[PDB]
Write a protein that binds this ligand. Structure first.
Ligand SMILES: CC(C)c1ccccc1Nc1nc(SCc2cccs2)n[nH]1
Ligand SMILES: [Co+2]
Ligand SMILES: [Co+2]
Length: 355
């Protein structure tokens, strides 16, 4: 069948063949054809996760409006996301919590229980959510606004992101992408509420390589010059994301924490403490090394877990990821896409007709 208005038909039931739509294929800036064909089931897994992301976001953009609480926006997005991705434990599901960072806050903000924050008409909200199939994660995000005064800011970041996406490729030095991204970003000048600004990349923020069940696999893609000359290799997966800002161009820890994630390199740790032991078991069964948030714990009937979560954090078993905000009064925007460095070409797998 086809997709229903409010989606509900999982993406695997819409492509009975098992073959999923391919992302935009780009030529980098026979044999390495067989090498690509060999990892097809993997590429395909990424694609299924991407089609889910495209349909979920198109839905969100249809109803996101000032007046709705942040909690309402995230639960509504996630419920659709679970459906289309056809959540199945760790085989299929949500790669990470729905980021909806507001204004000066650039990333990693998702509401915890009791948050009464309401989306406003002048807010610049960054929606960042991920879907995965067998750990093949799709990290893709866009910015939402209602007041056109941000229009040029959004175009700057979007243009910077696609610039980074175009400069990416096998053997491409990582610091050149960063340099490229910045040059485009700072070529934009905007005016918001009577004041003008030259958009500046958030220097301490950046794209990253992606591994199975591992959102941030190790390498970083700067969005400013002065980065590392390390090159992108064949077969790597990257999250190309840029952040524009009218503030200082640097984020810092701010607000209450909501995102958490088990340290990928830590092994089995014996825990005798009742509640801490239980919490860890819950994290291992439900999220493994995938990031989660407090709402996803309440959702599982867990309560009285804050201290256990803290214990796990102090044990280095779980790392917290607090919201990252620029200075009060500044505005930040973001655009992100996941790319596949295949042997035959560069594929912006999460590309849509929207962005
Ligand atoms: C902030 C910085 C670039 C960062 C540090 C460590 C892990 C992941 C990310 N990136 C990222 N996260 C996301 S969405 C949700 C997540 C929250 C915490 C980890 S993943 N998009 N990009
Ligand atoms: Co992201
Ligand atoms: Co990312």
């Amino acid at each position: 069948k086809v997709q229903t208005d409010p989606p509900s038909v999982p993406i695997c039931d819409l492509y009975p063949n098992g073959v999923f739509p391919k992302g935009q294929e780009c030529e980098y800036p026979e044999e390495k054809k067989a090498l690509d064909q060999a990892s097809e089931e993997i590429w395909n897994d990424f694609r299924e996760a991407a089609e889910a992301h495209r349909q979920v976001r198109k839905y969100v953009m249809s109803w996101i409006k000032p007046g709705m609480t942040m909690i309402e926006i995230c639960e509504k997005l996630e419920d659709c996301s679970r459906k289309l991705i056809k959540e199945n434990g760790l085989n299929a599901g949500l790669a990470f919590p729905t980021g909806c960072s507001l204004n000066n806050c650039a990333a990693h903000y998702t509401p915890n229980a009791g948050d009464t924050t309401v989306l406003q008409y002048d807010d610049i909200c960054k929606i960042d959510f991920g879907t995965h199939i067998s750990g093949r994660i799709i990290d893709c995000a866009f910015t939402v606004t209602f007041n056109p005064k941000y229009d040029t800011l959004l175009k700057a970041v979007k243009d910077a992101t696609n610039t980074g996406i175009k400069c990416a490729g096998i053997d491409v030095r990582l610091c050149d992408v960063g340099e490229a991204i910045q040059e485009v970003m700072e070529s934009y000048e905007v005016e918001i509420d009577g004041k003008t600004y030259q958009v500046k990349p958030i220097r301490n923020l950046n794209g990253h390589s992606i591994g199975q069940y591992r959102i941030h696999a190790g390498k970083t893609v700067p969005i400013i010059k002065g980065g590392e000359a390390t090159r992108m290799e064949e077969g790597e997966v990257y999250a190309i994301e840029t952040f524009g800002s009218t503030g200082k161009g640097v984020v810092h820890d701010d607000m209450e924490c909501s995102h958490y994630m088990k340290n990928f390199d830590v092994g089995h740790v014996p825990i005798r403490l009742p509640r801490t032991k239980h919490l860890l078991n819950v994290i291992n069964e439900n999220f493994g090394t995938l990031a989660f948030c407090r709402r996803w714990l309440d959702r599982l009937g867990e309560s009285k877990y804050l201290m256990a979560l803290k214990n796990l954090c102090d044990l280095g078993i779980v790392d917290p990821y607090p919201p990252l905000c620029d200075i009060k009064g500044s505005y930040t925007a973001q655009f992100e896409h996941t790319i596949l460095l295949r042997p035959t070409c560069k594929e912006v797998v999460s590309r849509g007709d929207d962005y």
